[PDB]
Amino acid sequence: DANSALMELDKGLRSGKLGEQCEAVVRFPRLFQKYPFPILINSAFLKLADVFRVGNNFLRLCVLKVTQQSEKHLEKILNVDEFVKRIFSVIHSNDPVARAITLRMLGSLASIIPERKNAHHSIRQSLDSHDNVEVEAAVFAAANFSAQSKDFAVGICNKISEMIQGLATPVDLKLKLIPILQHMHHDAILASSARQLLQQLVTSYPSTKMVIVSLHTFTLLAASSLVDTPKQIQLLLQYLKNDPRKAVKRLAIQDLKLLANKTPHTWSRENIQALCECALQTPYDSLKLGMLSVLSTLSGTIAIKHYFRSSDLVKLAQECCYHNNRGIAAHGVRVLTNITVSCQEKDLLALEQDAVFGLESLLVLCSQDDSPGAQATLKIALNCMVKLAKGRPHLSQSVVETLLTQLHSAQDAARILMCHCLAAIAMQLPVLGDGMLGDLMELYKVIGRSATDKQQELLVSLATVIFVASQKALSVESKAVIKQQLESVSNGWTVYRIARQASRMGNHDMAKELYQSLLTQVASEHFYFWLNSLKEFSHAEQCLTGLQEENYSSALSCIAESLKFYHKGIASLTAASTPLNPLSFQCEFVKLRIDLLQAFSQLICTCNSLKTSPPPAIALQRCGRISNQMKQSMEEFRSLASRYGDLYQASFDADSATLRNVELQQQSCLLISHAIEALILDPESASFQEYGSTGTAHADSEYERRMMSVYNHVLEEVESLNRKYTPVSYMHTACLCNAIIALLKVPLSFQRYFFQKLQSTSIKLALSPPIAVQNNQQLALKVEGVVQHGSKPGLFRKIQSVCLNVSSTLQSNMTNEMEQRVEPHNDYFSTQFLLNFAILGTHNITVESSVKDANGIVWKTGPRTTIFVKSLEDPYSQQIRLQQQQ
């Protein structure tokens, strides 16, 4: 328990032998983590301060370690005055080590008790002491208090100035004394005075260590106090060009990199021109590398736009793009890539091909040696390749051509990286399939005897880029791929990942071939069901490959054959579920695919029923059955769109691509429903103009591209037939069936969240707990919960809200609609609700927890929690009610 543990620690404290006392004291922070109760924390820290006051210096050192480790629990100290009062008493001890530990203690407590003026006085008096340990402890405490108190900072800046300018202060103490000044960012005149002092420091103490420390802390101070940033930048550039020392230049580079990383927008054209002049002028390749890293960092941001045709930056980047050193070349060509993708002037057209051939040279240079630095430069160049092919799409054919011509000769690691780059490029534009597919395939043959380590990953990456390149069916090619896998892989994890990529790119026949091969070699039954279900889904999607335009009987046959294997697969996948990792997204995604294919089958059946069931003698109306079943299909497709929507909303942990894929499923459902409506049900009042800016339809994948193309074709076909015909004509049937067939022809593309869960999160949702309550004494409920996280919390989406919605019902209607949005503030939210149960029956309480992310999107993710509350009146109130009821 809490008290028991504290008592045990106090027993260890009183032990009087130093070993047990130190053991107990250093055992204190683990107790704080175990039981963060403020009464316990306050009493425990009081005991710690008391043993600190009376106890040898090693015990005090252990207490200092505790206070440094338990900085967060200091906020939960109530008796601050007593605690500090007994800590502070040992500053009067004549023992300088005890004074030093006390000063460090006050420095550790600067957060909770700043503006304690006697402590300030102790720092100030101990600053000019004689013992070296006491002076260092005073310096450390001064740093902490200057970080906390504005009054202390302004009081101590003058003392520090006269201490540096003092002559009895040795050089090393001056060195430790300077970076107190980085904490003078509380005030403008304070910062200006500190800046004046630092200028005096660099001019009067020009040693390498002292100029380094002074101009680095001046950089940090100007970084915090934003007014001094431009003069800091110009001072750093001036020191970079003028000061001959390599250490000073290296510091100027590193801290200018810091400034460019935090406030790139404040950089002026003059500063960038000065830095470019420095880079051109220097003969040292390490310095050139450093300031070119600074230039690349600036060029990534908007500073280049502020910088602006030909200029010293452009001359620099062209000159350094072909440098002998690889790092300078990598940074220079990154600068070229950023400038090329930023602006669209007419001189830049000559610059782009310079950049392209620079990237070419980097591929020839960095693709052989296999050094880690070569991997870094190759990654820089390939990321640049991806960037300028995405940003300047008219320049991608040459990019892919040099990637193809180089993929033959590069080493295995370079092959992996170039395959990743090529896969990105191919995903961003589809007009280069069959040719480059054949070249990567003839490359695929020679992968069976490359190496032993990178062979598997190279196979995965090469098969991935093969699938991205491909957009059709392949049989002898799939035979070659399968033969390669059986011959050289014999692993399965490579086969499983390759099959995963095949499912992702929609190549489902060969994915079925691989998944079927993996059933035998798995060991657990859950994974056996999962792999079997993937085999059935892949086979079911390949059943739709045999569709044909304007052949609706074949469409019905193919959809039925697809649905059979889909049903077998969903049964198997539901068998794959387990308490741990329950396949919720996979179950619901496949079930919505089930319902979508069944809706398509029903719609095609009804469209054929237009002629397979002519209307009766009834003199819309006169087509009663076909109109009613059109209406039912409309309701079904709208419900399907709604279910895709709440599946989206329940997918809080999914990546952006999976959410876009689900969004595309929802949009296909909405497209079919709207086509039904505007062709059959309400053509007159659906006078909508499809005036959407389709030019900016940035498709993120070939699958999404086909989705938008088929949406656009169906919508314009519907628009061309708004009011032309009577709403039960065979042309309406042809339009709807062609929409269904075209929608199904583009194969399904499973995504990452289906196969791979990242950024998991959940809510425990504890609350006050067949519960009776007096009707008059309305219920007061406490609801609280913690947000769990798998690895990093904020990977994709950031959570700052919990929109807890709670309702009620009787005879387990909706009497207690109420909600509260609470920021957790420590990954733990807590709030209360008041609930009325004036009805003397039994009320069921349903409490939900939706989440509003940073952008304002609400995700129904939290658990659905239900309890039953019995409501009743006391017998005296019941009795007076009975007497008063008549």
């Binding site: 990286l417 399965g492 499983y496 995963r500 791979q756 998991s760």
Partner: peptide
């Protein structure tokens, strides 16, 4: 840090429990 293919499925070296368990059970 720097990545070539921003959307890459093989990026995650240490995977979730499902993929870790599936990997160990098939890397042999």
């Amino acid at each position: 840090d720097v990545s070539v293919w921003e959307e890459n499925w093989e990026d995650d070296i240490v995977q979730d429990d499902f993929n870790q368990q599936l990997r160990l059970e098939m890397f042999r």
